[PDB]
Amino acid sequence: TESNKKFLPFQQFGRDIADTTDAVRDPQTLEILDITPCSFGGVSVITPGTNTSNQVAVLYQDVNCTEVPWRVYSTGSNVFQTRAGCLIGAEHVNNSYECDIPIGAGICASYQTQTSVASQSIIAYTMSLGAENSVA
Amino acid sequence: YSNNSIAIPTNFTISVTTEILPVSMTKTSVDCTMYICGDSTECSNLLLQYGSFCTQLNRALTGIAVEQDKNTQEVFAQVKQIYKTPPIKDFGGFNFSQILPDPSKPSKRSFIEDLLFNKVTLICAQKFNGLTVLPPLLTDEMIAQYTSALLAGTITSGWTFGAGAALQIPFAMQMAYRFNGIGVTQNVLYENQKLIANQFNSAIGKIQDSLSSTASALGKLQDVVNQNAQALNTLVKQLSSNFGAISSVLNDILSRLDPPEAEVQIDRLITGRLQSLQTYVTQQLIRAAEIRASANLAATKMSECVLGQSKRVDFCGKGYHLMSFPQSAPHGVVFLHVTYVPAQEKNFTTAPAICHDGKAHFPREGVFVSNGTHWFVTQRNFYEPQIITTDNTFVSGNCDVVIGIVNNTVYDPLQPELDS
Amino acid sequence: KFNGLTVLPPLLTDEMIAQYTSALLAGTITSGWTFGAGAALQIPFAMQMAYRFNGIGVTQNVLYENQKLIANQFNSAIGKIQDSLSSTASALGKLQDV
Amino acid sequence: YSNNSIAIPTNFTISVTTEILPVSMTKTSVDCTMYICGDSTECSNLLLQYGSFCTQLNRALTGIAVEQDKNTQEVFAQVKQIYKTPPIKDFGGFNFSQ
Amino acid sequence: LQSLQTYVTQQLIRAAEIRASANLAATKMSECVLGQSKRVDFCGKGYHL
Amino acid sequence: GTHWFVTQRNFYEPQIITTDNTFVSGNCDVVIGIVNNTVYDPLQPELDS
Structure with missing residues (x-):
């Protein structure tokens, strides 16, 4: 990409702590390109007990869901973005419950078995800390 | 010290004492092959043919992470249901706006913990080197709401919610129970309600001030965060070494060397970086066990001080203890202990017992003091x-076995009621 | 010491440590249990032990029933403790282990 | 045991016992490069060719040292003010000179 | 380096162990001395004074 | 509502x-939220004898 770091005359590459190569100068046209390796979030599988089902959801770590394309299919507009990362395979429910599977950033997932809509669904949602109850 | 000298205190003070506990650290993770090598195909083969080290490290780091999560869960877990603050504040004159959360913020934080949030608290470089950071499941908001429910129950129900169902009982009777727990009978509290209210609210204001003026008391959380961050930056800077090998960049040396000599040079470089990663993860395990120790300590406090009253001393702050209001902090928990402390001391001459009618007399609850006359x-x-009166005494034996007794009269509460 | 690995000095000397322990002991004896909570209070040791008896579950009067007797056992207790140490070395075994 | 037969103690005892505990392991410090390198010219450079170990080990050991310090200063220095024992020792039988 | 490193790791582990024992001693000192802990077989065999 | x-x-x-399991201290103004009722006394019958 294009960087704004002002470039000294003849020094070529810009580094950081990591001894890697952070910035460069295009030798042909002296322009100061920034080098930012595109993010690689670790894939994390979200599943109920396989004794129950075989449809599961995939949680990527914090990445731009745009970067997400061995995936079989991407759920259409139901890719639910958390503060933790993109999650494909779960409809963003608002009906809060107590949560079994930790997803992070307050988000928890769980299996849901409906009568009509997705009798085998794997939902993710904002966890309820409990049944709120104030005493008089 | 003398065989008849006692000093019973007469004027007391509630005093606020903060306490700091590193309940968790930043959940950390290091993709094994990713840090050692930037996904080069030769590192793939070499690290594969090396062993199952990197999978070991992934398992250990995920264990650290899930254990930190268990810590954060259990340290606040003692909440069956999220209680909520009653709207009005008729707490016998105990201004709780600083400790309790109010809808000033869209978040349910409190005015005090904002100083924490702001005072205790380059990752772009680490984010590209495999060295990532996961987020904590219990977010700041839900941690804050757990602290809110804890304080709400501690105010409205004393300890019954720790044991069973939450039970309404006003703060007056709660302080009365706690004073009874530390010896001082309810009479003092109900005779000095307004005085103790002024003392309590003033102390809360003074601790709010003392935190607002300097950020040096909130020490240990800062030290934990710095230890973690310095470990991470050491782990990164470690990449820059050469270990006798050609250069600190794989993709570089892959150009200079054919597969054969690249094999041995990268053998050396990988042995180096991998020994370093092992050192890092070992120190991380050790600090994680230390944090879990301090977290079990925090849990013992939160389930002993907060949800009850520790008869035992110096486990909930200096002095006789009453109760403790917990508050969240970035990767930490702070307690506001409100401890009873006697202040003004008057000398008196004491008697271990009393001889009234040839029989001994012993104080059933208190101590025999005097100023000479009465x-x-x-x-x-x-x-x-x-x-x-005989109500405060139980006669036992005679006037011989006792040592240091004094003669006196013990008034009988019946004489006028016997005259008629 | 000729190969770098010196032993750093322990911060608190044996003198000040023994002084701290003497302070703890004095506060326990005379000031009762208050000195760790607030300000120290002169208060008779016999009555202090009586309060502790009331603590464990026996009524304080019992102490005054047998005051001298107690001390005897107490003092004789101390006695054995003394000889309990000089007799066998492995009675003190943790510190030596460390 | 039986449903109506209690036991009660009549005479009692005191048994002073010892409970030893460690506080501070000998706070050691190992020089990073004096041990490894025999203070030479090429070896020291070959050492600093390795990573930031010289700081790593020494830093962890300094952490051990400061933790030993805090241990010694927290397990003992809970007293507020160093107390002096009284001039006379009248405890009604509690000889304390040991 | 490998030898010194295993030494440092074992020393830090034993240091954490001593730290745990020291906190235990802190609790004992602040309960068996600065007060009277009713907890049986925390201070010592039998009721504690 | 009654007793x-x-x-x-x-x-x-x-x-x-009963005045046996109750005790007095001071007056009836320093306290807060107090209520009015006659504390029962056991010493009336046998004093009537």
């Missing part, structure tokens, strides 16, 4: 004069 | 306020 029974932790 | 009862903080056990 003898009185008093509560062992707050000066309270009382005439010597 | 005050003293009861421990755990299990409901009604108790008309």
